[PDB]
């Protein structure tokens, strides 16, 4: 289930943030408007980069951390005022952030494994309304 996944994510987290970011970024070409570093890279030189492994990882450590925190799929109202005052998410709208969970739960359904992609689907829909309810438009 949930906590499980968190647990698979964490066990080969660099490998995983980095494929479902790269998931988002190609589903959504547009998304790199507020990533003007990737433009014209293919996946293998965006990983091969220092910006993106790092950034990559930090935003999914936060993540897992955010998730392991929820319960029954229900962030913390904290984690998400955190989200929304961060000033690298000056840029953002919910939009954004749904964005990044859809691609997040096509990947679990391709993978070969047992994620829960319906509780991954939940929590995203539930921290964007967190999101929404602590002041992201
Ligand atoms: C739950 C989802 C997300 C989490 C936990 C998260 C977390 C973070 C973290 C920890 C950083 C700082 C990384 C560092 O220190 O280098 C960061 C930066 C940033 N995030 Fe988010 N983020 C999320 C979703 C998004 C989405 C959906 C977007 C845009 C579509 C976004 C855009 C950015 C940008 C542009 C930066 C600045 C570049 C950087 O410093 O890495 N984030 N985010
Ligand atoms: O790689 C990134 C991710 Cl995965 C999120 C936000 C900003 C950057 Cl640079």
Same mark, same amino acid.
């Given at each position: 289930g949930f906590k499980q996944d968190i647990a698979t994510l964490r066990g080969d987290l660099r490998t995983? $943030?980095? &494929?479902?970011?790269?998931?988002?970024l190609n589903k959504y070409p547009d998304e790199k408007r507020n990533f003007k570093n990737?433009?014209?890279?293919?996946?293998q030189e965006l990983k091969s980069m220092a910006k993106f492994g790092d950034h990559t990882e930090k935003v999914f450590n936060l993540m897992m951390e955010v998730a392991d925190?929820?319960?029954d799929?229900?962030?913390? $109202?904290? &984690?998400?005022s955190t989200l929304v005052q961060m000033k690298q998410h000056s840029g953002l709208?919910?939009?954004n952030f749904e964005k990044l969970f859809v691609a997040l739960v096509?990947?679990?359904?391709?993978?070969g494994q047992s994620?829960?992609?319906q509780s991954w689907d939940r929590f995203?829909?539930?921290?964007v309304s967190a999101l929404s309810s602590a002041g992201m438009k």
């Open positions: 995983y $943030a980095q &494929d479902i970011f790269l998931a988002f990737y433009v014209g890279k293919s996946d925190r929820a319960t799929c229900v962030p913390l $109202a904290s &984690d998400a709208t919910t939009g096509e990947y679990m359904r391709a993978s994620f829960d992609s995203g829909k539930n921290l």
